[PDB]
RNA sequence: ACGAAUCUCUUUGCCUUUUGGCUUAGAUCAAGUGUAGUAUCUGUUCUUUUCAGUGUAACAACUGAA
């Protein structure tokens, strides 16, 4: 049961694709060894930064 | 003195959930009064000269002059 993207669940999907898309880049930049806690932390910086953009 | 093992200690290094997501911050909402009375923290001043009176269980405290 793969559920299509519709009006109600649009912007949730937009979130999900954005978060993945950022982890891809930043993980492809860093040298190597440790990610996952670091992976989690980077995304919190993202969302915080978006909130800052809305509030100017 | 030296190859050199083990326990103790400092440092460098290593590090743990180093917040689960999303939207219109997702939205909205919040403290009674009066009369009498006690308890308990902190701050500030004094252990500093004699004698005479008031005072006190005794001090203390208060009141005068060298």
UniProtKB/Swiss-Prot annotation:
It comes from the Eukaryota. It is found in: Nucleus. Coiled coil: none annotated. The MPN (JAB/Mov34) domain has structural similarity with deubiquitinating enzymes, but lacks the residues that would bind the catalytic metal ion. Component of the U4/U6-U5 tri-snRNP complex composed of the U4, U6 and U5 snRNAs and at least PRP3, PRP4, PRP6, PRP8, PRP18, PRP31, PRP38, SNU13, SNU23, SNU66, SNU114, SPP381, SMB1, SMD1, SMD2, SMD3, SMX2, SMX3, LSM2, LSM3, LSM4, LSM5, LSM6, LSM7, LSM8, BRR2 and DIB1. Present with 468 molecules/cell in log phase SD medium. Functions as a scaffold that mediates the ordered assembly of spliceosomal proteins and snRNAs. Required for association of BRR2 with the spliceosomal U5 snRNP, and the subsequent assembly of the U4/U6-U5 tri-snRNP complex. Functions as a scaffold that positions spliceosomal U2, U5 and U6 snRNAs at splice sites on pre-mRNA substrates, so that splicing can occur. Interacts with both the 5' and the 3' splice site, as well as the branch region. Has a role in branch site-3' splice site selection. Associates with the branch site-3' splice 3'-exon region. Also has a role in cell cycle. This is Pre-mRNA-splicing factor 8. The chain holds residues 741 to 796 of 2413 of the full protein.
């Amino acid at each position: 049961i793969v559920k299509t993207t519709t009006k109600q669940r649009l912007d949730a999907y937009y979130d999900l694709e954005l978060r993945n898309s950022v982890m891809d880049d930043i993980l492809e930049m860093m040298p190597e060894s440790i990610r996952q806690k670091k992976a989690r932390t980077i995304l919190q910086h993202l969302s915080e930064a978006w909130r800052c953009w809305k509030a100017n």
